[PDB]
Specification:
The structure is a homodimer of 170-residue chains.
Chain A lengths: L4 H30 L3 H24 L6 H29 L3 H29 L9 E3 L6 E3 L17 E3 L1
Antiparallel strand pairs in A: 1-2, 1-3
Helix pairs in contact in A: 1-2, 3-4
Organism (chains A, B): Pyrococcus furiosus
Pfam family, one (chains A, B): Rubrerythrin
Protein name (chains A, B): Rubrerythrin
């Protein structure tokens, strides 16, 4: 595990850097597909996986990967900071600054993070007792990121998108 | 498209935070499966996808998504900063501070990014004049992120991994 302050900071910044690049590339891949360059889309996804490899290495070298229950606790904390602190403030500044599109994306994010904290809380009870959770499927709204386990409403309660548009993990 | 300095800076931070959360959840997913929690892994992956939705929204609201050629150009500039500036320096700091794991992960990242810039450079050329790239397969080393198109090397020149460990994108 990395312990020297500067090196740790540098690897933290690299982890952030690799995460952003991975994310940029997945967004770019989707755009490339829409423009009819499926092979370039494949190129972006594959390189995104390389960035994931790099980020995972940095993440592990910094000692931030533990067991599933602790990982879930890190999730609960991150989500809670976003719900309670970050997004309410960013949302309010956006509104105060008349930036309507930023008011939208922060509101989309905020409502979904609320759900994530609770799901992770519920899964941690299970993991800590050595039990996997019992779930059939997860629905994600591809517009606002609204998240439902097993059953979802016919329309996204945040953005109004129809259930048929939801992304299903099963 | 967000113009106010504060809101923009906040969205940029939120995009960074969303990218890292997505990355963390993908790392946690892989760990949850290894520990025998396939459903928790499924929950990690699904939520990671929701973070992708939030980051894409912030990214688009920031005006950062263009057409494939200009997306490739932004990729090229990012890769070039990593290759020439960030990782040589982080690698040298890690070595100077005696952090051998960090020396390793920065070396791993470094060697792989050199390949990335060149491929995006090649793909941009094609994409500018309306062509998709020609190329069936991309190969990625799951240990160091080494990248090879069409044909895997007999072993990874960076980490030494057998041809057969490479992840295929086809
Ligand atoms: Zn990288
Ligand atoms: Zn979340
Ligand atoms: Zn929605
Ligand atoms: Zn989010
Ligand atoms: Zn790269
Ligand atoms: Zn390798």
């Amino acid at each position: 595990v990395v312990k020297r302050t500067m090196t740790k900071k540098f690897l933290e910044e690299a982890f952030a850097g690799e995460s952003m690049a991975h994310m940029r590339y997945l967004i770019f891949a989707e755009k490339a597909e829409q423009e009819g360059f499926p092979n370039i889309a494949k190129l972006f996804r594959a390189i995104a996986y390389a960035e994931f490899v790099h980020a995972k290495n940095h993440f592990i070298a910094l000692g931030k990967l533990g067991k599933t229950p602790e990982n879930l606790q890190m999730g609960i904390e991150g989500e809670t900071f976003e719900v309670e602190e970050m997004y309410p403030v960013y949302n309010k500044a956006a509104e105060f600054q008349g930036e309507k599109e930023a008011v939208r994306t922060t509101h989309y994010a905020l409502e979904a993070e609320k759900i994530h904290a609770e799901l992770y809380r519920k899964a941690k009870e299970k993991a800590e007792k050595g039990e996997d959770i019992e779930i059939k499927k997860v629905y994600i709204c591809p517009i606002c990121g609204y998240t439902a386990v097993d059953e979802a409403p016919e329309y996204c309660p945040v953005c109004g998108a129809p259930k048929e548009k939801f992304v299903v993990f099963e």
